[PDB]
Design a protein. Structure first.
Lengths: 235, 235
């Protein structure tokens, strides 16, 4: 079954221990390098690929929302060759997207992330599919043209992500516009390093506030440009 | 929200890796000492306190069904003094009810238990309360009378659980009727060692196939008798 993407009201947060956990979980997801420096090896927070409005994280259709995610695990992973839990999946995002180290599976910060994801999933039937889950891929027949992609990047992306892909810092030292390549970006093991996933994300979410504005060809070619560049190597 | 206790159809099991996991999970829950001997320190399987029909485990109202349990975690534990995950909760049942050792939080058998619980929870909204969850307690004002309880035990329980509480083995060496005290029963750390929980279980589920037949006084007193006896000590 597919159900709608619903976002709960932060005014109806439970109190007690669970509410305090949810609030800490939102912070870990929004501000991950500063909150979890022992585990993060780049400049990315979860929210840089799992954006949300109103200070929430992971609430946007076609940008891998967390709404409903708790009810989809455990599930099979071809990386692992077996079923994995949601804790383990978060571990892989720390190791790959954040170029870091997985939290222990009972670490309190990991549990607070889980509590926040569960809060966002409230009312979703276990096993159901949320409309707008994941990042829909975009695939062309034909190798991306990074020459075209370089021209598109300069015209549509550079002002935010920079001529050297290094992003723009905000006043408090967190990325306002995150790095797309180089030492502070996602590593080679990340899902965003796959052509069709980057092309899909770009097509649906970029340029910022212009969702679904690039033609399919343009998203494909600019993703290819972006992925020509060096970034940290995953072991 | 409270929703109904629904049990899925084993004929509609998913295939692939998830279906194979679910099936292994049902076996670990039904036949735990034989399947997980490194982790089990008594004669109990999960199904001896979380019974189910038709070979399922954890599907009976007022006998702590697993239907819906996945959507109730993480939650606060006063034992731990913080939020815990469902994997951690299962660990505590291994340590206390099964007098053993917790599985590692990524152990494949634990994940297969989780997969089975998730399958049983299919369609339950995350966060909802399933009708018949847990084991409703029964509490009297007044200390249980174990003299009364001994007479009730002889008349209503002994034929199955034995004069020495040691249970009845089946032909394949698993308990048909499980031990209520002594070295093969639950340890002192288990929830069933608490007077009001044992009284509630008994009242709602015992004698077998005579749910809600003891008066409240009778359940209370027989639970008290049962809990006068030695059993393994929890560290
Ligand atoms: C971009 C560089 C990412 C960063 C930073 C983080 N994640 Fe991610 N995540 C990313 C992709 C491309 C995907 C795949 C989407 C799909 O179609 O399924 C994911 C997925 C997840 C998931 C699974 C979601 C699902 O529906 O199954 C989770 C739980 C997840 N990501 C969590 C997560 C966390 C907690 C992060 C910070 C530690 C994180 N991700 C960063 C891309 C990126
Ligand atoms: C500023 C107004 C932006 C423009 C123009 C573009 N992007 Fe962007 N991007 C921006 C933000 C604020 C974020 C974080 C997520 C959000 O949706 O809030 C992003 C994220 C990305 C990512 C993922 C994260 C990462 O790799 O660091 C990618 C791959 C990305 N953006 C690419 C991209 C491209 C190719 C653009 C031109 C077509 C583009 N972005 C424009 C902000 C802005
Ligand atoms: C009786 C001696 C038990 C054995 C054997 C096992 N469990 Fe148990 N479990 C027992 C009690 C008395 C309770 C509390 C019920 C309540 O009202 O909440 C539990 C609870 C659980 C739970 C949590 C259920 C919930 O709704 O939150 C789980 C997940 C659980 N038990 C699992 C479990 C497993 C997997 C077992 C075998 C390893 C196991 N239990 C054995 C009593 C007994
Ligand atoms: C045989 C027909 C039984 C009679 C009579 C009684 N019990 Fe029982 N009990 C029986 C089974 C098959 C099981 C497993 C769970 C099931 O519902 O399938 C149980 C379980 C218990 C337990 C929990 C497990 C344990 O501690 O080992 C308790 C505490 C228990 N039973 C107590 C109990 C008492 C006090 C009875 C007389 C009032 C009684 N049981 C009768 C089978 C049978």
């Amino acid at each position: 079954p597919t159900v709608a993407l619903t976002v709960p009201a932060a005014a109806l947060l439970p109190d007690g221990a669970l509410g305090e956990s949810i609030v800490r979980g939102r912070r870990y997801l929004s501000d991950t390098p500063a909150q979890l420096p022992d585990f993060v090896g780049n400049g990315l927070a979860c929210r840089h690929c799992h954006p949300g409005r109103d200070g929430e994280v992971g609430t946007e259709a076609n940008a891998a929302p967390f709404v409903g995610v708790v009810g989809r695990f455990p599930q099979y992973s071809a990386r692992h060759g077996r079923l994995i839990t949601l804790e383990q999946r978060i571990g892989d995002c720390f190791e790959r997207s954040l170029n870091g180290r997985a939290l222990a599976l009972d670490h309190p910060a990991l549990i607070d992330m889980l509590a926040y994801m569960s809060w966002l999933s409230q009312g979703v039937p276990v096993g159901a599919v949320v409309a707008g889950h994941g990042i829909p891929t975009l695939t062309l027949e034909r190798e991306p043209d990074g020459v075209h992609g370089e021209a598109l990047y300069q015209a549509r992306c550079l002002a935010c992500h920079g001529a050297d892909g290094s992003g723009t810092l905000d006043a408090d030292g967190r990325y306002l516009f995150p790095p797309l390549w180089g030492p502070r970006s996602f590593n080679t093991g990340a899902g965003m390093n796959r052509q069709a996933t980057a092309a899909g994300f770009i097509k649906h979410k970029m340029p910022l506030g212009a969702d679904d504005s690039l033609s399919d060809e343009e998203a494909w070619d600019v993703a290819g440009f972006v992925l020509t560049h060096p970034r940290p190597l995953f072991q």
